[PDB]
Design a protein around this ligand. Structure first.
Ligand SMILES: *[C@@H]1O[C@H](CO)[C@@H](O[C@@H]2O[C@H](CO)[C@@H](O[C@@H]3O[C@H](CO)[C@@H](O)[C@H](O)[C@@H]3O)[C@H](O)[C@H]2NC(C)=O)[C@H](O)[C@H]1NC(C)=O
Ligand code: ATP
Ligand code: ATP
Ligand SMILES: *[C@@H]1O[C@H](CO)[C@@H](O[C@@H]2O[C@H](CO)[C@@H](O)[C@H](O)[C@H]2NC(C)=O)[C@H](O)[C@H]1NC(C)=O
Ligand code: NAG
Ligand code: NAG
Ligand code: NAG
Ligand code: NAG
Ligand code: NAG
Ligand code: NAG
Ligand code: MG
Ligand code: MG
Length: 1687
């Protein structure tokens, strides 16, 4: 019956799914909200493609001084123009052109060279004519006019820097004052804030050898020449007064000058003196003063000294504090490459904030783009490393060679092709694993809760007792839970693929991966649900254990290096870790732009060696391991309801049971024997232990000793041969809520073993025999006690049961159905060994062929009924043989002191629950910090020698221009010999370069085209706009009409590239290397890293040398002063004029894709220059220069200025703490719901408690239980020294945040306690809702506010203020803003600006606090508002009297009461009128379906009415519920007690709440306990009583305190004759006192014989309403039946 049982289980699960569809829909739609938000954001963030653009030139200080400053000031940004920059042209050399300074210099050159001979002749002494001719062209130029216009600009704008940039580029206390004026504009302050160390620096060298002194003297030349401004200012200062005196009072000389004159504008220039003697003088004076201040800005004393390297490091550490460090050069002594001098080793040390990190030679991932960010990529330019290296290297070359080389190095970045990027893919790749792991948290918790709840209510054990096998049940659970997971995974795959989040991947492999993940999760949940045995405890520790298995993934991704593959494999056993590895592999495959379309299953040999074909096998292995572990754990440890762990049909011998809680054993020893087919009956007093014995016979409990045999087998050990031979009937019915009676019987009959053919007749026969045939399409949750009991006994009798045990077959059942019970028992008595147990003696004597009585755990006597006769009286004899008011505000003080005490007691018995509910979430945060704070230590950045030999094979350049010079040829051959290509011998003088062969098709295409090097040779390539398929441009074979002349060397290849355009070659060829390199797509072996270009064209006019002649022809005359100031300025003018001719350029093309690229090529260029200028000889290797790079020992890390917060450990810890604090405000509803459901809260509300006091007491207790997690969180943060969160500056913010979150979350979970029926489901649902609304709101807004800034910043600002109603959001954003502000403050402190903000601000945390405080108590007000939502002939004569007459004596008056069960056609209760006077024990009988309990619930106040009224002592229950509730007592059919408290606590609590004085509380409780026979069991917890004791306790809580009217419901459902005698005596006493009773039952005596006014009720209508003797006279069980048949 394996397949039949499987079909039955699947059908039942399908029926449950179909009955309630909303839960199915919400489960299927839960894990997609965050992905929906992500897709919505992505839809509005189109991919961006960048146009082609070329980068500009960058001169080095070796090329001069003016161009160096020009390139430093103008080219701050890497503004790349799409049009070709003039610098890239081989002929051109000066990118900056037609500017003010360049035009001024050129025009000055021209004017000075034009008439040098004329001024020489003038100085020889006509000359006036030559001077006039020169002055004629001194006005033709407009450069002087524009210079005057610029220097006359009114002062303002941003400062001198703006005018300096305008002049250079193309469209001392005073110095400090200028800086302070300039810093007001951050745009103008960019230059200062990037160039602070250049003005203030110190150059330090460790050795003090005179060789190093010569090196520094050679370095010092540029600083020496920079100070000519002081000398020229002094010269003008000396000339000032002299010319000022000469001009004044010299009219005679001037007039004789005009007399000797005898063009015209020159003659009129001295006229009136307005335009000659002051304007030009003032302008030149202002200019010289300005340059004097400029030269006084500099310190001019940059160099310093140091004894050794230790003193160097100490002085560096001292000087680093006050912004004075710019150097560190060390002339280390290798003595080493080889013997002999010239093997100098320069080792530059500089701060880590300025030099690129040397950890990585290249980048990490192939990101398409030139990577030319002028703020975080080109650090070597704005830092000054390259300038210092060039200066030191040129000085070393000058010292070693002894010559005067002239070769100005330049820098040029090659262009980059068109491309398109997807930033969103990289952004989401980091946070995908967290999203995916957090998506499936609903289903795991619900699965664990469902499993533990099914195993808790004995439903699983009862279902298994009839023949179910554990394997079948487990497989059914597996399939049923696995279904929705697979459907949801398929839907998620579909939505991911359709949304273009993962466009490349084929959905099949992704779906298989997700299905494997889902299977692993299912089996993990089934394993996790095997430790616990209580619904509350299992629900509490259900999400923490799942989410605590994901942190090791973070630990193992932080420790990526130094990790053996064995460790990764051993840490991949946990499912979330393996899924994280798989998700990372898939994300990196997607980012590579190659997809996973069924052929990428053995790829990725990198650090992420795992691909999406090895993780799935691991996941399946983990699922198998978890399943085996679950099976073993279930087999070895059953749980609370411990199943056994591997013709006298029934026999028990020496059977005893011992519960740990009870000091005395329940059972001592039994020897009872069972027989063939004689109905046996158990008789005994309450607490004898018949139900415990019956459970011991079944598999519910294990015996504490002895053994029990059934059908010759043994329930001990081998009980597997018992299942098809047993039938069970628990005292408390266990049934499926949704399934109806017909489905119940069909399911149990099929499971029992009946064939599919014999079902209908048997089921119908049993259903008719029992008496339930009138109802067949109603679910069991709409049935009263009697119908449920009849259904339970019917289910017990379904199928062929060899031995069946009946326990309380009838209870609350009228005799009419008891007759059907009798006939059912008689019809099956032939061999089925019927066993019975009831308190009714008539049934025992009528059926019992042998009666056995047990008392006090011992078999008193067993035998035939005739044996004992020689029945109620003798059984009772045997059992006997064996056995003012405090009123006012003071009362308000008392009530609370009771109520809170109750809570405290409920907290003392169950400490494990509190430990797991209000402590464990705090320790989860500590575990998160422990696992997220362990990082690998770092030491020092290693030193490396900078040369391109560390890259590998590559491609160089050879471009040359103007070959008609020997020096350029020598330098070029030096470059070739340095590259590695040795000089070929005489036989290969011209056999050096091997030109490859052009393809035939390309050759034909070029023949159809033009073979012109100075025209665009390559064909145009198509740009690809988005389209997600082709990122780079479309390649072609037309790039370069000749193939490059590749010549191999010792590992490198050098080409020719002479005469070609040289700009299109790289652009057209790069996409070929882009597409060719696909194996790794992270560290692709690019072949083009850099090259040279020897442009020998000199940007000097041929007349420039003439300038020097002019200067020297001014030196001989004018009496050169011996002081030397004039002499020295004239000789630095002559030197500048001579150097204006220059020698050549050595332009360097560098690729920024390789980090350490420009420095190595500068090194090689300088080494080649040295080898060129060296005299010929075999000492080529004897003299070599190497540049190192080693940052200081100062312990810091690379400051990522551009990279802001990017979903890091900070937000991880914030998510962890939010998760931990979301669980705590859910344990507060368990007790509330448990009280409301069992109708125990309403008892207290009857006691005299106003709802307001109840709610305030609960609120205070819940508040007192919230401060325990917060203290532990604060202590953990303090212990771990988390500066970001806890510190003497931000501690008040955290304290207020936690305290007010506690203040405002608690009164929000109260309204949810009205609409739930089982506590654990409410617990898990509220926990999941809190988790979702917190995380997926706050962290989603955080993701929105970062990364993309396309007005999504404005969208996030809009959404931020809206999410203030939820008190969960006020903890997420608050704990992220603090971290962000702390990070910004730390960055400012590291920078040195020393700016500190404030934690508590309006726009930081203040608004959240204010809003959450103001919304705090509104939820409590809503809670109270929702709580106060409710705003014959005798019968006819009685109705007429009630309608018209007004009996003031009567206490309770009913007026036409009726109410319908939400459309059940015939109203159960309708049109009732009655009047009761004081001091009459009213009674009311009926049948199972009359509606007695409905009448009690309608009149007592538990349910709201429909029509009519129920007035109780003046105040109506509906009009004023409080006044009616003031004085009455209740006892419902379903007993209302607390499982953990005891009886004495119950009585004392009710006594205190009613208002009795404190002194008499104990006396009243003792009297109440002793009155009803409850004393020997008045200290044990109320949860361990049996049915009779619980009934007695429930009755006792209805009479304590002497109320007015007692609304006793059926009180004798299971009480014993002694107990019922006690109850009758108590009722007689209370009615003698003068208080009425409204007992209703099916029994006799006080209900019937001692009653006062019976009233039979059938189908919601009264029948007689007459006295008992009156009923007997006019018309006792048979009399009642006759009267029922009378009408
Ligand atoms: C080396 O090859 C480059 C190709 O990149 C040549 O530059 C190209 O020069 C032509 C000159 O006509 C440019 O055409 C112009 O395009 C603009 C675009 O708006 C148009 O408005 C003009 O009317 C003109 O047609 C072309 O854009 C430009 N290519 C670029 C910038 O990528 C360069 O001249 C070659 N070197 C030589 C021939 O020495
Ligand atoms: N779970 C339990 N833990 C500890 N003691 C228990 C437990 N259940 C019952 N007992 C105790 O064991 C004894 C046997 O009483 P038991 O509950 O078995 O009676 P019963 O057969 O159900 O009787 P009744 O006919 O009155 O319903 C009592 O003292 C009872 O308090
Ligand atoms: N939840 C429900 N939904 C629909 N009908 C119900 C529901 N509960 C009870 N009924 C029906 O409404 C009527 C009211 O009966 P009620 O529940 O008051 O039982 P009772 O006969 O007074 O109790 P007892 O079973 O203890 O003798 C009955 O016909 C019953 O079958
Ligand atoms: C690289 O190619 C150029 C192509 O011009 C070579 O320069 C030519 O060299 C030959 C022989 O030396 C001369 O006859 C030509 O006159 C040169 N060209 C021009 C325009 O003058 C150059 O020699 C090649 N590189 C090397 C190292 O040989
Ligand atoms: C460089 O970029 C900054 C920042 O966008 C901008 O303000 C400035 O105008 C740009 N150009 C120059 C020459 O600084
Ligand atoms: C740019 O420089 C060249 C160099 O000779 C010069 O001829 C030209 O006038 C300058 N200005 C331009 C091209 O606008
Ligand atoms: C000479 O200087 C005096 C002031 O020092 C001035 O008043 C006078 O005008 C000057 N003379 C000439 C001719 O500039
Ligand atoms: C370097 O030049 C500066 C000029 O101010 C000065 O310290 C000195 O002349 C030189 N120092 C040397 C040669 O050590
Ligand atoms: C330039 O002038 C400075 C002093 O102003 C002098 O030290 C230096 O030697 C001069 N230049 C040359 C090449 O002599
Ligand atoms: C940095 O200084 C520490 C001082 O304890 C020393 O142990 C370490 O070796 C130094 N590192 C380097 C690279 O000099
Ligand atoms: Mg019992
Ligand atoms: Mg009832």
């Amino acid at each position: 019956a394996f397949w039949t049982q499987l079909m039955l289980l699947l059908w039942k699960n399908f029926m449950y799914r179909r009955r309630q569809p909303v839960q199915l829909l919400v489960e299927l739609l839960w894990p997609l909200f965050l992905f929906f938000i992500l897709v919505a954001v992505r839809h509005s963030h189109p991919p961006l493609e960048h146009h082609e653009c070329h980068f500009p030139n960058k001169p080095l200080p070796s090329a001069g001084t003016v161009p160096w400053l020009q390139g430093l000031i103008c080219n701050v940004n890497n503004t790349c123009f799409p049009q070709l920059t003039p610098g890239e042209e081989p002929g051109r050399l000066s990118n900056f052109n037609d500017s003010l300074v360049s035009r001024l210099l050129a025009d000055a050159r021209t004017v000075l060279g034009g008439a040098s001979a004329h001024r020489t002749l003038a100085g020889l002494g006509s000359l006036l004519e030559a001077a006039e001719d020169l002055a004629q062209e001194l006005l033709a130029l407009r450069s002087l006019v524009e210079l005057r216009a610029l220097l006359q600009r009114p002062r303002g704008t941003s400062g001198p820097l703006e005018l300096l940039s305008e002049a250079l580029c193309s469209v001392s206390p005073a110095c400090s004052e200028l800086i302070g004026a300039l810093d007001s504009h951050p745009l103008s302050r960019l230059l200062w804030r990037r160039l602070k160390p250049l003005i203030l620096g110190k150059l330090l060298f460790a050795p003090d050898t005179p060789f190093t002194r010569k090196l520094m003297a050679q370095v010092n030349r540029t600083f020496e020449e920079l100070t000519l401004l002081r000398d020229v200012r002094e010269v003008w200062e000396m000339l000032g007064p002299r010319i000022f005196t000469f001009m004044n009072d010299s009219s005679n000389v001037a007039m004789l000058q005009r007399l000797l004159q005898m063009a015209l504008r020159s003659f009129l220039d001295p006229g009136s003196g307005g335009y000659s003697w002051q304007d030009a003088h003032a302008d030149v004076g202002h200019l010289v003063g300005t340059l004097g201040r400029v030269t006084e800005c500099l310190s001019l004393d940059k160099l310093e000294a140091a004894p050794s390297e230790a003193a160097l490091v100490s002085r560096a550490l001292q000087l680093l504090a006050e912004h004075r460090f710019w150097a560190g050069v060390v002339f280390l002594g290798p003595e080493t490459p080889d013997l002999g001098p010239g093997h100098v080793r320069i080792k530059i040390r500089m701060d880590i904030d300025v030099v690129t990190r040397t950890n990585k030679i290249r980048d990490r991932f192939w990101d398409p783009g030139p990577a030319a960010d002028p703020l975080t990529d080109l650090r070597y330019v704005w830092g000054g490393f390259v300038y210092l290296q060039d200066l030191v290297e040129r000085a070393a070359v000058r010292v070693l060679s002894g010559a005067n080389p002239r070769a100005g190095l330049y820098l040029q970045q090659m262009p980059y092709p068109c491309y398109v990027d997807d930033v969103f893919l990289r952004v989401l790749s980091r946070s995908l694993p967290l999203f995916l792991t957090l998506a499936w948290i609903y289903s795991v918790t619900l699965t664990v809760k469902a499993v533990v709840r099914e195993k808790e209510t004995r439903l699983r054990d009862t279902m298994r007792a009839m023949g179910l096998s554990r394997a079948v049940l487990w497989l059914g659970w597996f399939l049923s839970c696995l279904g929705p997971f697979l459907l949801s995974a398929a839907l998620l795959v579909l939505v991911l693929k359709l949304g273009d989040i993962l466009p490349y991947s084929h959905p099949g492999v992704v779906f298989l991966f997700l299905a494997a993940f889902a299977v692993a999760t299912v089996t993990q949940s089934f394993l996790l649900s095997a430790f616990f045995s209580r619904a509350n405890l299992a629900a509490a520790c259900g999400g923490l254990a799942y989410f605590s298995l994901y942190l090791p993934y973070v630990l193992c991704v932080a420790w990526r290096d130094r990790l053996p593959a064995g460790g990764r494999v051993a840490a991949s056993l946990l499912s979330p870790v393996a899924f994280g590895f798989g998700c990372e592999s898939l994300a990196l495959l997607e980012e590579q732009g190659e997809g996973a379309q069924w052929h990428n299953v053995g790829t990725r040999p990198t650090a992420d060696v795992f691909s999406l074909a090895q993780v799935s096998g691991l996941l399946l292995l983990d699922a198998a391991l978890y399943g085996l572990a679950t099976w073993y754990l279930e087999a070895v440890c059953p749980g609370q309801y411990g199943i056994p762990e591997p013709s006298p049909g029934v026999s028990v011998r020496s059977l005893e049971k011992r519960f740990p809680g009870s000091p005395q054993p329940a059972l001592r020893g039994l020897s009872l024997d069972f027989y063939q087919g004689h109905i046996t009956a158990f008789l005994g007093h309450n607490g004898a232990g018949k139900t415990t014995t019956l459970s011991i016979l079944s598999g519910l409990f294990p015996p504490s000793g002895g053994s029990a045999f059934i059908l010759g087998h043994d329930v001990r050990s081998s009980m597997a041969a018992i299942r098809p031979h047993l039938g069970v009937c628990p005292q408390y019915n266990v049934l499926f809520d949704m399934l109806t009676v017909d489905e119940h019987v069909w399911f149990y009959g099929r499971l029992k073993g009946l064939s599919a053919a014999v079902v209908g007749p048997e089921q119908d026969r049993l259903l008719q025999d029992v008496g339930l045939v009138s109802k067949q399409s109603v679910q069991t949750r709409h049935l009263s006690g009697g119908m449920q009991r009849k259904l339970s006994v019917a289910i017990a009798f379904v199928g062929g049961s060899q031995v069946v045990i009946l326990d309380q077959p009838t209870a609350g059942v009228d005799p009419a159905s008891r007759r059907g019970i009798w006939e059912l028992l008689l019809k099956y008595r032939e061999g089925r060994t019927l066993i019975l147990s009831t308190h009714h003696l008539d049934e025992a004597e009528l059926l019992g062929d042998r009666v056995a009585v047990v008392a006090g755990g011992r078999l008193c006597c067993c035998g035939s009924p005739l044996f004992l006769r020689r029945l109620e009286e003798i059984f009772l004899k045997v059992v006997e043989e064996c056995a003012g008011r405090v009123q006012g505000w003071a009362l308000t003080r008392q009530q609370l002191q009771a109520l809170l005490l109750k809570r405290f007691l409920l907290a003392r018995r169950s400490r494990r629950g509190l430990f797991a509910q209000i402590v464990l979430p705090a320790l989860f945060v500590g575990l998160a910090l422990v696992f997220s704070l362990i990082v690998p230590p770092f030491g020092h950045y290693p030193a490396l020698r900078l040369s391109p030999t560390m890259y590998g094979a590559q491609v160089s350049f050879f471009s040359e221009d103007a070959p008609g010079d020997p020096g350029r040829a020598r330098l070029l051959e030096a470059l070739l010999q340095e590259a590695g290509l040795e000089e070929p011998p005489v036989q290969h003088s011209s056999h050096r370069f091997s030109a490859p062969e052009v393809p035939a098709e390309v050759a034909k295409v070029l023949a159809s085209g033009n073979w012109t090097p100075e025209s665009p040779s390559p064909a145009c390539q198509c740009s690809r706009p988005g389209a997600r398929r082709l990122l780079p441009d479309c390649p072609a074979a037309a790039g370069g009409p000749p193939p490059p002349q590749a010549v191999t060397g010792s590992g490198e290849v050098v080409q020719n590239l002479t005469g070609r355009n040289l700009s299109d070659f790289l652009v057209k060829t790069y996409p070929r290397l882009v597409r060719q390199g696909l194996k790794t797509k992270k560290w692709v072996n690019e072949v083009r890293y850099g090259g040279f270009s020897l442009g020998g064209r000199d940007p000097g006019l041929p007349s420039g040398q003439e300038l020097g002649r002019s200067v020297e022809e001014l030196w001989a005359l004018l009496s050169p002063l011996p002081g030397g100031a004039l002499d020295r300025v004239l000789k630095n003018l002559t030197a500048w004029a001579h150097s204006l001719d220059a020698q050549d350029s050595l332009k360097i093309w560098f690729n920024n894709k390789g980090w350490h690229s420009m420095v190595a090529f500068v090194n090689r260029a300088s080494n080649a220059i040295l080898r060129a200028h060296l005299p010929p000889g075999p000492a080529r290797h004897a003299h070599s220069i190497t540049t190192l790079n080693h940052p200081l020992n100062l312990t810091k890390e690379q400051l990522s200025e551009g990279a802001l917060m990017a979903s890091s450990v900070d937000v991880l810890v914030s998510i962890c703490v939010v998760f931990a604090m979301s669980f705590v405000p859910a344990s507060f509803t368990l007790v509330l719901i448990e009280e409301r459901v069992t109708r125990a809260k309403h008892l207290q509300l009857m006691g005299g408690l106003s709802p307001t006091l109840y709610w305030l007491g609960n609120f205070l207790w819940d508040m007192c239980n919230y401060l325990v997690p917060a203290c532990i969180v604060v202590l953990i943060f303090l212990a771990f020294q988390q500066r970001a969160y806890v510190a003497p500056a931000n501690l008040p913010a955290l304290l207020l945040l936690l305290l007010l979150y506690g203040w405002s979350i608690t009164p929000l979970m109260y309204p949810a306690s009205f609409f739930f029926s089982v506590p654990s489901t409410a617990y898990v649902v509220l926990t999941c809702i809190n988790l979702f609304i917190g995380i997926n709101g706050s962290m989603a807004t955080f993701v929105l506010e970062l990364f993309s800034d396309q007005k999504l910043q404005e969208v996030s600002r809009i959404l931020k203020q809206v999410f203030l109603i939820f008190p969960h959001f006020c903890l997420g954003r608050g704990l992220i803003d603090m971290v962000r502000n702390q990070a910004m403050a730390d960055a400012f402190e590291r920078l040195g600006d020393r700016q500190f903000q404030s934690p508590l601000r309006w726009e930081v945390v203040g608004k959240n606090l204010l809003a959450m405080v103001i919304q705090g108590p509104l939820f409590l007000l809503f809670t109270l508002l929702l709580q106060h939502r409710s705003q014959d002939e005798d019968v006819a004569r009685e109705r007429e009297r009630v309608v018209q007459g007004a009996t003031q004596g009567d206490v309770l008056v009913l007026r036409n009461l009726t109410k319908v069960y939400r459309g059940q056609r015939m109203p159960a209760v309708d049109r009732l009128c009655l009047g009761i006077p004081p001091g009459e024990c009213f009674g009311l009988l009926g049948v199972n379906g009359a509606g007695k309990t409905s009448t009690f619930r309608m009149v007592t106040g538990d349910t709201l009415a429909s029509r009519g009224e129920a007035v109780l002592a003046g105040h109506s229950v509906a009009r004023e519920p409080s006044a009616a509730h003031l004085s009455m007592g209740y006892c419902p059919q379903s007993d209302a007690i607390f499982e953990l408290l005891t009886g004495r606590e119950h009585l004392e609590l009710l006594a205190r709440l009613r208002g009795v004085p404190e002194a008499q509380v104990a006396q009243t409780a003792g009297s109440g306990l002793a009155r009803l026979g409850l004393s020997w069991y008045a200290d044990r917890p109320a949860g361990t009583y049996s049915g009779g004791n619980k009934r007695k306790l429930a009755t006792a809580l209805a009479l304590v305190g002497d109320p007015a009217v007692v609304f006793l419901d059926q009180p004798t459902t299971g009480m014993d004759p002694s107990a019922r005698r006690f109850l009758w005596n108590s009722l007689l006493a209370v009615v003698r006192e003068g208080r009425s009773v409204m007992l209703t039952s099916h029994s006799m005596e006080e209900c019937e014989a001692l009653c006062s006014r019976l009233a039979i009720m059938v189908n919601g209508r009264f029948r007689c309403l007459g006295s008992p003797q009156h009923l007997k006279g006019r018309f006792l069980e048979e009399v009642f039946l006759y009267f029922s048949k009378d009408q």
